[model samples]
Target chain A: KMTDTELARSIRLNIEAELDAINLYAAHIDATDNEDAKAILQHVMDEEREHAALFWELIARLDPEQAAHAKEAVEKYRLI
Target chain B: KMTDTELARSIRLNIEAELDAINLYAAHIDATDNEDAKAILQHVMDEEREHAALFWELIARLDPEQAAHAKEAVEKYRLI
Candidate 1:
């Protein structure tokens, strides 16, 4: 039984993990020579990005404070 | 630039993160009253499980030591 805060933390950690997976897969794709392996790794990496996006949505819904920070960051860094 | 060993470690960590997300989503589903939220969380959790399965495949291919341990654990604990 987790509070909303705990759930938010968990979701944030999940997002971090997804990012890690995405980066690792990208690196693997770069290091490997096999076209088949590169293709699969790229596919998996894209999926991981989607997972991260989903978690971001969850966290923004679950935690107002975190969501505010995210909004602030987006505004601060947006190019257009 | 990641070596095979580093990539294996990252993949293992990603699997762990996927498991964490799966558990967190299950908890969220149980805690929430909104049917829509429950449905979405369950769907996302299932996808996380798939992500974990993919990471498991990558780790098994990348790290023989981890794969052997996984095989040993299955054999040691299997009831059937």
Candidate 2:
């Protein structure tokens, strides 16, 4: 029942959540010594990036200012 | 900065989002003809389950009633 504006804001919030998962899974991967656990956690962490992308793509489409800021942040952080 | 109650509710909402990814990745896996694409999608879908579990574990710890309902739902679905 939300408007596009509301949905855009929701996606912005969700991007942070996927980052949280990225951090958690990576830390768990490092915290464990089991090979199977490491493989699975690595897999999980990689997928979190995809999850982040899903939100990022939508948010960027719906909000130009956010998208511009994201581009700036990426460049500043040397992500690209 | 959220209280425990807010954090628990956030986790509950996130579990649904993870399930959404699970559905999307599994569908994409079936839609793709490329073996590598299918393998990657399957890996991503499997990891979405881990993400769901991460949220579910926190939700269960914070709310025993929700945990009871989850157990009931799982039994009804023959997931156990």
Candidate 3:
């Protein structure tokens, strides 16, 4: 069993990790000539977005600070 | 003012947008020659992570489905 602190840190790190993957794959698409490799990289890059979402969802539940800030950003940034 | 539907969609879209910014900034960091430019891009990329968190927080409050699944992801992915 993980402590709340551990869980929170892991979730936060995982979010960063997913974003890291996106950066990596997107860069690889520009770096590589292999069409098959590019296709797989594109597919995985797409999935990394969902992976970030999954982590964000968990952080929302366990981290009230994050939840409150998220709402505040919407309030501050809302264009409509 | 946004309806619940609009609010949910915007929050979701914002998450993707932030992730998009991350990829762009990261690549820019690689593409630029000026050390100053790279430093600023890195700073901005860090900020985008916070922006994504902010939107995720809003989603948790505004969408019950998101909140439920967020909790579910924590349980499913928790390593300890």
Candidate 4:
């Protein structure tokens, strides 16, 4: 197999949790008044999204055979 | 069993990606007329390469199964 990262449900949950955090941080950025605070918050928010991307890549690496299953919801939901 | 780490070819692809990014930024750095942006981008590019190398140390820790796999991969790719 070109990709052999072992699939685990536990890590998938962690991925979802981080995405939730990203949503919260993005909101916090909007409610901020100071420019500096916005910059720091926005940067950290971007980092969190990057972390989520890392987890997603891991998820894709793991069980690459089931990639269609993992990506189905995310990819298809965007189509509507 | 715990997963892999650095010091070998286990993280080989990561380092490769980092190098590719380094080249992209290096090109941009050379092309950019702005002194300040060039300086910051160049600094981040080098640091990113170092981070990629940090992951390479993982392959050196491979067990027999992993070591063999890594060795074969190394030979196939002609990587040290």
Candidate 5:
């Protein structure tokens, strides 16, 4: 089994993936003017946001030793 | 509700949408380097393929007049 730090890194990387998905759906939503396409993209983006929330909820439970890095990653969503 | 021919037309549109999803996921799988993402994409792709097959299974059972167009659409999904 990985140490807590390694597990935390793995989780961070996965969350970054979800972030990439968010950006992808956001771009699609912005690019398409069709109402049906826009609505569908918006719906998918909502799920991506939910996924990002789930990632942070996991991060919130991590050890203090790992919290600093995890918190830094979590903060990006707020700034954007 | 549509007549059998109209229902078949709607199903064709839906199956085409599924085909688009298959192609989208296929592109993502090819683009992503991560094994986890690749595996999940593969699973989704498999499901999309099944969606296409099942759609035609319904098509094959309905209105004989529409069979050739339906079969042609199914074949197009096959070639690329």
Candidate 6:
């Protein structure tokens, strides 16, 4: 039983988890010598990146305050 | 710099992370009153489940001993 705020927090955590998965897969890809395993790990790592992006969109929609901060951060740091 | 064994272990951790993401989305869906949010949460949760399944297959391929244990567990517990 969570409120909307809690739901937004959970979505943020989900995005973090996806980022962690991406890192894990990247590490595995770098370590493995098997070309087959490396291929699949890279594929899965890409999917995790996609998942993180999707969650970012969802979180922005759900939490305006967080969304504002995210926009500011992107503008402050992003290079074109 | 990890061995194949460590890579297999990392894949297992990735699967666990996906499962956690699924649970987080489920919680968000249950908590949010907004129907749009709920719909997106459910869709992402399904994706997380797919991710977990994909990782499971990868782990099974990487670690035969774990795969054997998985098969035994399924056979022991499956009703259908």
Q: Which candidate number has the best DockQ?
A: 6
Order the candidates by TM-score, highest first — what do you get? 6, 1, 2, 3, 5, 4
A1-80 per-residue lDDT for model 6 (tens digits): 34455676767777787888788778777776777767877877787788788778777766446657548878877766
lDDT order of candidates, best first?
A: 6, 1, 3, 2, 5, 4
Residue B62, model 3, lDDT:
63
List ranges where model 1 is wrong by over 4 Å.
A65-80, B1-41, B52-80
Residues B1-80 of candidate 4: C-alpha lDDT, one tens digit per residue: 11332212323554465466567556555453554434545554665565445434433443334566557866888764
Q: What value does DockQ give for candidate 4?
A: 0.02
lDDT of residue B46 for candidate 3: 65
For each candidate, what's the DockQ?
0.21, 0.09, 0.09, 0.02, 0.07, 0.49
TM-score of chain B of 4: 0.57
TM-score of chain A of 4: 0.70
4 versus 5: better lDDT goes to: 5
Best by lDDT: 6
**Given candidate 2, what's the lDDT at residue B43?**
59
Which pairs clash inside model 1? none
- Per-residue lDDT of candidate 2, residues B1-80 (tens digit): 24344344444556777787677555544443554344544655676787788667656655356756658877888964
Residue pairs with backbone overlap in model 3? A2-B80, A70-B54
| TM-score winner | 6
lDDT of 1 by residue, A17-75 (tens): 67876787787677656565567678778877877887677666664456576588788
Ranking by DockQ: 6, 1, 3, 2, 5, 4
Residue B35, candidate 4: how far off, in angstroms?
41
Pairs that collide in candidate 4 are: B5-B58, B6-B56, B6-B57, B6-B58, B6-B59, B7-B56, B7-B57, B7-B58, B8-B56, B8-B59
**Candidate 6 lDDT score at position A47:** 75
lDDT of 5 by residue, A1-80 (tens): 34354445655655676677567556544443455434544654575566566656655555545556668777887797
Residues B1-80, model 1: lDDT tens digits: 35455455655666777787677677666664654456556666777788788768766666366657668878877767
Model 5: CA > 4 A from native:
A1-80, B65-80
Model 3 CAPRI rating:
incorrect
Give interface RMSD, every candidate, in order: 4.3, 11.4, 9.7, 18.2, 11.1, 2.8
Position B77, candidate 1: lDDT: 79
Shift of residue A43 alpha carbon in model 3, Å: 0.9
